[PDB]
Amino acid sequence: ENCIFCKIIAGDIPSAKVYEDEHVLAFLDISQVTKGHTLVIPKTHIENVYEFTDELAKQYFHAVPKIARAIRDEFEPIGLNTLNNNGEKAGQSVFHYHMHIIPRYGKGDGFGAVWKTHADDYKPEDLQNISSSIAKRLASS
């Protein structure tokens, strides 16, 4: 288990905790993209968002809103984002599911989303075929 997050859950590595219960553990990201940068992870070692089961999703997500409101009330930012990365090329460096809670203050934010639209590259029927394909795989969910 060469997972830095499992060692933080196990206490082997110190952390600045903000929230903790039976299945969830939240703590400040030492990178602090912005003041209040928090990491919310499940204690169960789940590699990515794909390995989530309904039962595990239930013991996890509820903490996100609570922690988000706590950060918003403490530092009253002008905005806030939640980000999850799955896969090296998606930005995931540690293979243990984690959600970033990033408060926004404006000028100086260490986080920003590059947004390149491509709406003119898809026709209504293409979108319908694409969605229809994803949906078919979901009939079993």
Where does this chain bind Zn ion (CB under 5 A)? 3, 5-6, 45, 96
> Among 1, 12, 22, 117, which residue interacts with a copy of itself (rule: CB under 8 A)?
117
- Segment 81 to 140, residues that bind Mg ion, using CB under 5 A: 137, 140
CB 99 within 8 A of CB 81: no
Residue 4 binds: one of a copy of itself, Zn ion, Mg ion, none (C-beta under 5 to 8 A by kind): none
CB 78 within 8 A of CB 105: yes
Sheet holding 17-20, edge to edge: 17-20, 24-28, 38-42, 99-104
Q: Closest distance between Zn ion and the C-beta of residue 61, in Å?
A: 18
Distance CA 18, CA 26 (A): 6
Our finding on whether 7 is near a copy of itself (CB under 8 A) is: no
Our finding on whether 111 is near a copy of itself (CB under 8 A) is: yes
**96 a catalytic residue:** no
Nearest CA to 40 out of 11, 63, 72 is that of 63
> Among 12, 22, 50, 76, which residue interacts with a copy of itself (rule: CB under 8 A)?
50
